[PDB]
Amino acid sequence: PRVKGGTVTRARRKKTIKLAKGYFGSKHTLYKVAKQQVMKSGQYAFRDRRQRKRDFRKLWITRINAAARQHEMSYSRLMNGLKKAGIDINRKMLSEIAISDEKAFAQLVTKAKDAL
């Protein structure tokens, strides 16, 4: 029996064009150009997903350092003091309390200095 093509090639190419909605120029129209951009998009997302965690950790440290400078002490000196007392509070919770309750963060700063 002769197996002729039809309704299989077209249904598979239109899925790639749908995934490329919103691209510039021919990158959302032509299958060959749009197919290459989808592979690049998938590779970028895998890399950016793991890189996203480093960027947000560096943002918390920057905000913690700025808030600590107002108490005449540094970031590298503050974090050493907390671990002596065993505070065990990460950067994410340290940053949120340093902008919501500025009085609450002052209590932690005093405790770190007491432990030297």
Binding site: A66, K92, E96, I99
Partner: protein, 143 residues
């Protein structure tokens, strides 16, 4: 996902004034640049401008170190064949004390769209009097 972000509707900007009497050119510029970028604020946002305005008085009477009076040269090109110009740091300080301070500070800021705007909040004056009295500038003590 509970990280706070700052936008144009909840940002307060202030004005500060700094005097450049007897300060090293690069050491004064290093601390000033961190104020324009808002790095000293706790609500710092890398994609939003959160800095403060800076006024620098006494552009002249700024001190160098070593032999930088005649051994520090600034070059530039006019995009023409063979056209290159130069000037020393000592000559630039007394012919144009304002441009000397601006270039050193502006070279410490990122060269992006937001960085090109954060450098527009710096004001440099050769004398000791500034015309921005309608604002509320406060004296700033260097760290």
């Amino acid at each position: 996902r509970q990280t706070f972000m700052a936008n144009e509707s909840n940002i307060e900007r202030k004005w500060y004034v700094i005097d450049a009497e007897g300060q090293t050119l690069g050491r004064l510029s290093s601390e000033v640049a961190s104020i324009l970028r808002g790095k000293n604020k706790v609500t710092y946002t890398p994609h939003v401008d959160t800095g403060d305005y800076v006024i620098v008085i006494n552009a002249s009477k700024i001190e160098f170190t070593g032999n930088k009076e005649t051994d520090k040269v600034y070059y530039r090109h006019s995009n023409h064949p063979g056209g290159i110009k130069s000037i020393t740091a000592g000559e630039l300080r007394r012919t144009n004390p304002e441009r000397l301070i601006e270039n050193s500070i502006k070279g410490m800021l990122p060269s992006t769209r937001l960085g090109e705007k954060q450098g527009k909040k710096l004001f440099v004056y050769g004398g000791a009097e500034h015309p921005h009295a309608a604002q509320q500038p406060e004296n700033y003590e260097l760290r």
